[PDB]
Ligand binder design. Sequence first.
Ligand SMILES: *[C@@H]1O[C@H](CO)[C@@H](O)[C@H](O)[C@H]1NC(C)=O
Length: 395
Amino acid sequence: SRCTHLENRDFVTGTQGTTRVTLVLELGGCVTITAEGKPSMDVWLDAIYQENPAKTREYCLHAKLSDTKVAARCPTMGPATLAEEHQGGTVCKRDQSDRGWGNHCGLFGKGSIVACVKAACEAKKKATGHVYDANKIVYTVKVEPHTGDYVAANETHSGRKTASFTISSEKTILTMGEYGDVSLLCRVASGVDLAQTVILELDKTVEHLPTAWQVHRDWFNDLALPWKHEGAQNWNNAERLVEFGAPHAVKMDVYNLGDQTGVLLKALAGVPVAHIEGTKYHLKSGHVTCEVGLEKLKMKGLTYTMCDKTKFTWKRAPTDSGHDTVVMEVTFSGTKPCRIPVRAVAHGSPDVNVAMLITPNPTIENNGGGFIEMQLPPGDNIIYVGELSHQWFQK
Ligand SMILES: *[C@@H]1O[C@H](CO)[C@@H](O)[C@H](O)[C@H]1NC(C)=O
């Protein structure tokens, strides 16, 4: 059962008459649903994402400066000017330098000086923000029936089904193989509010970093870095990463404040990560409430005869699942298919069956069955699968 793979697992149980079940599925969680006369089902919210979300601003973390130009005039010669002062994509500073005979001016005094640099951004040194549209966000829910077959996490359960939901398409009917149809009504509106969320992306090809972060819109909009719209050619406020030195005669130095990535990363510690897979921008945390309709589900193998009580052996002896249940797997050497005669008694009371089965109507099919998950009361018990027995101390 898929839910046995994780630590975060909930059990939902429907009694007599319970045909519908309302669950709050959370990313990283898993729910096992059990109900009288119904095959058990594992359900979980698998992903929350939007393909190609809209991009808000792009910020530059490392300025690439080039073509530094300086123009200086002697004290009586008027303002110094450069064509660059009027071009976008350049950062300039006008100042005054001390001039005199030493640097070829007729008078000793203040002379106009102006320096400009072309400012661009280093390749792969942008920080881009993305915003979600509640109407385009997709919630993916997976359902897997309890078939008495154990499948590891790196393996694929042939009976697992997937359902996708958007605000405009909240209901799906899934056919669970021979178990019947299950209906899922999940409301995206009951999900995570995304108004103040921005998915921040740096360079997703960097190997030792998460591919994205989920940050607050107000924090993102206040970053003190050069910015522009995707598609725009030049950067606004490029001066944020450039400093000019005090001028001396006909020269003025231009300083680059360096790569701000390290600075940003310190700010991002403790911020939740997100994930990008191609064009899909995923949230790594979130939840949604769904209504599961069980009325069309039917159990499998109810009319088989009981398996020969003499032909069972333990493939995997009873073991603690970590969810206060016991898991085990048996092998049957008799004729299939048949119902597995499972029960358990408390040490000293051989007459009362104390086993509460999670796995519905355990059966050995022609090519499956054998895995059983059950709950037992605290203390010493003995598990029986026909004549096959096993001691079990619960707790
Ligand atoms: C799953 O992982 C195990 C252990 O690493 C390996 O032996 C097995 O072949 C894997 N199976 C698949 C389908 O990846």
